From a paper:
To investigate heme-dependent azide reduction, we chose the oxygen storage protein myoglobin as a model heme system. For this study, we chose a variant of sperm whale myoglobin that contains two active site mutations (H64V and V68A), which create additional space in the distal binding pocket and are known to boost carbene transferase activity. Apart from its native function, myoglobin is remarkably versatile as a catalyst for carbene transfer reactions8−12 and additionally exhibits promiscuous peroxidase activity13−15—two reaction types that are mechanistically related to nitrene transfer. Here, we investigated the reduction of azides by the model heme protein myoglobin to gain mechanistic insights into the factors that control the fate of key reaction intermediates.
Author numbering: 0 to 154
Amino acid sequence: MVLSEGEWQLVLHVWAKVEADVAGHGQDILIRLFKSHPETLEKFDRFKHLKTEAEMKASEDLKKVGVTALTALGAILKKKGHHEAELKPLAQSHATKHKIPIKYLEFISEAIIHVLHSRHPGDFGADAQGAMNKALELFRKDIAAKYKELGYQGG
Ligand code: HEM
C-alpha cells in the first residue's frame, strides 16, 4: 500500500500515542505551525485575536478545530493509503473554502513531526519518522492531485 506494512505499523504505533490526548496534540501542532510560519494564522479568521501561546491554549474553539483535524488525519492514516473517499471531501474544503496551498500542508506536516518527536521520542525514532514522513508525503501528493481535479493548482 505504497508504504510497506512495517512502515504503516510504525505510523499507526505513534498515532496511538497521539490518540491518548488528541486535544493536546492538536493545540501544540497548531501553536507550532503559527510560531514557525506566522502567515498560516491568517487562514483562521476566529483565531486572529489570539495574541499569545497561552491565549491559544485557552481557546476551546482552537482546541476543537485541532481535534476535528487530527481525527480526520487519523482516519486517513488508518486506511494505509486506501483513502480516496476520505481525502476527496478534505481536498474540496481546503482548496475551495479555506484556500490552503500545498506548501501550508508541508508546514503543518513539519509541525506534526516536531510535536510527535517532542512528546514521544522513544516511540518516534528515525525509522518511525521516515515512515510518518512518507505517509504525510502520500497524503499531500494525493490531495494535490484532487486540488488539480477541482481546478486548483494549490500554489
Ligand atoms: C494534516 C493536514 C490537515 C487536515 C487533516 C485538516 C483537516 C481539517 C478538517 C477535518 C476540518 C473541518 C472540516 C473542513 O472545513 O474541512 C478543517 C478545517 C479547517 N482547516 Fe484544516 N486540515 C489540515 C491542514 C490545514 C492547514 C495547514 C490549514 C491552514 C494553514 C488549514 C485550515 C483550516 C481552516 C481555516 C479550517 C476551518 C476551521 C473552522 O473554522 O472551524 N487546514 N481542517
